[PDB]
Design a protein around this ligand. Structure first.
Ligand SMILES: [Zn+2]
Lengths: 236, 117, 40, 129, 41, 67, 50, 52
RNA sequence: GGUUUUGCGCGAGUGUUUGGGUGUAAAACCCGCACGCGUAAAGGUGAGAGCUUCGGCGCAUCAUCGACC
């Protein structure tokens, strides 16, 4: 199996140890032969240690630069393994959504916005790569804006196990409040581009599906207000 | 049930931690005398009498004469090498006999004997 | 004596019933991303 | 009432949670769970795995079964269905048998986090005396 | 180096903004109903 | 676990607690903004906290604690 | 927290870390501790009478 | 610290107890996006002005 | 030694402390076989808390008719 000796140091109580381990994870992702062979089990180890990297970081401006540095890691990876990396992020942050306390939730809510902000930035090359389009939005249909309450991880065989991760409701309500802010930031809401109106529409149809088919009252009111914002092309 | 003088005949047990120390010191005092030998003698495997406890099995008092002769241990040597001997018990079945001459054969394998003088 | 026989057999069957229940509880009790292994 | 009889700090923590949910929500579910948190042990009888299974025998599956009591295991039940149980306490055999069947185990604070109004829940009570 | 607003604080400010416009609208609805009631009594 | 820490300090025992018969309780912790044992001004129960203290050289410092 | 740092003889961090065991994540129950400690402190006592 | 996992596993008749509360930070339970999205509007303030 | 109620642990099981092991030694920590108590040796209809895709499900408990020993 792969040698990953820096995950231990990402949980250290010293910042220079944690900084060195974060610089060491740049080298692991840069090695294109290993990075093209990252598995779902492999990325789940990385984002767990990356979770405790942000869990340990102390002050506000350190928290923002780390959130941005964890955001600009999608560009480091090859194209063959970008999909499983984002799978690791949404699965790890599903596992520990409730377990974050009220004071450390601020920097992890920023991490979801920065990662989802990086995903819409990645899908830029019709001036938008359609192969990248089905990957980001398809993974937005699996964890945040889903119709099932569980996501199945890995495949059932004699060599594989079983991981079933519930999507928490709180993750749904956060992506609902930040998704318009992120597509504005990278520039989907330019009304001239016909391709851009297509991408805004298909996620807008996706959340509208979550509106009519959910059972949580919390999702129902929060998704309606996300549709009703004035910046959207339909409500303008 | 306090019709008689239960005040004059009540016994407490504050020596319970102290008697345990004495009992463990008696086992250490005994093992100082019998330094390479085990403290307790070997005892046979027997079946409990009644219908309630027929399925259970416990340690008896001593080995039968037929058990000792089948194992190859002479009778007059067995008390001097740590084997308890019961003359009252009889075998009465081959299952009681075979379980104990296996136990004595297993004792001899694990036994190391030192010459007299 | 046929009466005193079956009180004794009832108590024996009650005791054997308890001992079989003790074994069955033992049989029933017999039937990498972890934190203690990742940060080891 | 005015105060829980319990001395568990975590049971006082749940009462603080469900005093807020009873006050700031129209849902009658939060009012009855708060009243059952104030109750004593003889007024919170345990619920076996068999009793939960026979209230799921109709189309009540895919509902979060919620019980303000301790869920116990029933050896007379041979097969356990898949179910999401939310309760105060789970016994060790009951927790393992729920998880082995593919089900799930919740605490009451996780229940209020997931469904604060008690949507799509199924309240059960244990047998009295 | 600007230290942006906490994410949970942003949800308060949007909830507070909707509450203020609701209170202002309910105040004007209450004022006009009181003016009509003084004429009718 | 800040609520659990408050339940041990308030109900059971705190080494910094001074109890008077005048109706108010006092906090003997040197890192307390007000010397009172209420929830909002406990340096122990509050994982994030601030206080102001004076050095004997005359300098006033702002002490910030983060979780 | 996953790990705890191990400190050297001089007081400086050695560089090795140990995983915190699950017993540090156990519930903290002051009512349970008080009840046990009350009866525990009685167990050393030595009898007195007149 | 290495032995602490082992000594608490070797205790027969006992397992590490399950808490009745998973998240003991009550401020996270109450001041969450999921709880605060569903609440009724506040019926009053902390201090109530004397009417008459 | 009975009994009622509250708190607490565990839960169809529960109880280490007669005793053994160990110890910084009347403390604390550990448990091999027994033993005490206990458990074992699914129906309809109508009310009914709660939920709800507003169509309906229906806890506990009560009542009424059934089922089986
Ligand atoms: Zn205090």
């Amino acid at each position: 199996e792969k040698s990953m000796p820096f995950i231990k140091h990402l949980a250290s109580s010293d910042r220079k140890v944690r900084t060195a381990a974060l610089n060491s994870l740049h080298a692991f992702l840069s090695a294109r032969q290993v990075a093209s062979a990252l598995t779902t089990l492999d990325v789940l180890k990385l984002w767990k240690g990356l979770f405790y990297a942000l869990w340990m970081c102390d002050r506000a401006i350190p928290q923002q630069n780390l959130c941005n540095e964890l955001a600009d890691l999608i560009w480091q990876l090859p194209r063959e393994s970008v999909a499983t990396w984002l799978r690791g992020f949404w699965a790890t942050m599903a596992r520990e959504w409730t377990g974050i306390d009220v004071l450390r939730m601020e920097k992890f809510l920023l991490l979801v916005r920065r990662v989802l902000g990086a995903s819409f930035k990645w899908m830029k090359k019709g001036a938008w790569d359609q192969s990248k389009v089905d990957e980001v939005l398809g993974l937005l249909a699996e964890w945040p804006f889903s119709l099932a309450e569980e996501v199945r991880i890995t495949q059932s065989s004699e060599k594989g196990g079983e991981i079933v991760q519930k999507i928490p409701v709180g993750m749904r309500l956060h992506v609902l409040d930040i998704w318009v802010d992120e597509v504005e930031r990278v520039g989907l809401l330019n009304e001239d581009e016909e391709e851009a109106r297509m991408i805004v529409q298909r996620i807008s149809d996706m959340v509208d599906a979550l509106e009519q088919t959910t059972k949580s009252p919390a999702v129902r009111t929060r998704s309606k207000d996300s549709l009703g914002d004035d910046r959207l092309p339909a409500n303008r | 049930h306090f019709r008689k003088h239960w005040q004059r005949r009540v016994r407490c047990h504050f020596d319970q931690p102290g008697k345990k120390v004495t009992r463990r010191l008696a086992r250490r005092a005994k093992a100082a005398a019998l330094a390479p030998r085990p403290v307790d003698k070997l005892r046979p495997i027997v079946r409990c009498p009644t219908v309630k406890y027929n399925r259970r099995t416990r340690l008896g008092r001593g080995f039968t004469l037929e058990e000792l002769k089948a194992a190859g241990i002479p009778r007059l040597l067995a008390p001097t090498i740590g084997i308890a001997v019961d003359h009252r018990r009889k075998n009465l079945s081959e299952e009681s006999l075979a379980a104990n001459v296996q136990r004595l054969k297993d004792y001899k394998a694990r036994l190391i004997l030192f010459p007299r003088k | 004596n046929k009466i005193r026989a079956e009180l004794r057999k009832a108590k024996a069957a009650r005791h054997h019933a308890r001992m079989e229940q003790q074994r069955d509880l033992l049989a029933r009790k017999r039937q990498d991303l972890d934190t203690r292994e990742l940060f080891a | 009432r005015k105060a829980p009889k319990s001395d568990n700090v975590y049971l006082k923590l749940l009462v603080k949670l469900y005093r807020f949910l009873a006050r700031r929500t129209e849902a009658p579910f939060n009012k009855v769970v708060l009243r059952r948190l104030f109750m004593s042990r003889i007024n919170r009888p345990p619920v076996s795995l068999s009793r939960i299974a026979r209230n799921l025998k109709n189309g009540n599956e895919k509902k979060t079964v919620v019980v303000v009591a301790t869920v116990t295991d029933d050896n007379r039940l041979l097969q356990v269905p898949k179910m999401e149980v939310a309760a105060l306490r789970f016994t060790a055999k009951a927790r393992a048998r729920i998880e082995a069947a593919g089900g799930r185990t919740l605490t009451l604070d996780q229940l209020a986090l997931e469904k604060p109004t008690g949507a799509n829940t199924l309240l059960l009570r244990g047998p009295k005396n | 180096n600007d230290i942006l607003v906490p994410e949970t604080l942003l949800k308060k400010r949007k909830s507070q903004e909707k509450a203020r416009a609701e209170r202002a609208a309910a105040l004007e609805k209450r004022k006009q109903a009181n003016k009509e009631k003084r004429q009718v009594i | 676990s800040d609520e659990i820490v408050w339940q041990i300090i308030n109900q059971q025992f705190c080494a910094f607690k001074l109890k008077t018969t005048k109706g108010q309780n006092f906090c003997r912790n040197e890192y307390s903004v007000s010397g009172l044992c209420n929830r909002q001004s406990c340096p122990l129960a509050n994982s994030r906290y601030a206080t102001v203290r004076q050095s004997p050289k005359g300098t006033i410092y702002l002490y910030i604690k983060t979780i | 927290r996953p790990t705890v740092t191990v400190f050297g003889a001089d007081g400086k961090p050695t560089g090795a870390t140990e995983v915190l065991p699950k017993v540090f994540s156990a519930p903290i129950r002051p009512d349970i501790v008080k009840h046990v400690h009350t009866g525990m402190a009685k167990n050393k006592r030595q009898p007195y009478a007149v | 610290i290495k032995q602490l996992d082992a000594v608490y596993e070797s205790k027969k008749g006992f397992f590490l107890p399950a808490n009745i509360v998973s998240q003991a930070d009550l401020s996270r339970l109450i001041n969450s996006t999921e709880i605060q999205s569903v609440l009724r509007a506040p019926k009053g303030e902390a201090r109530t002005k004397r009417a008459c």
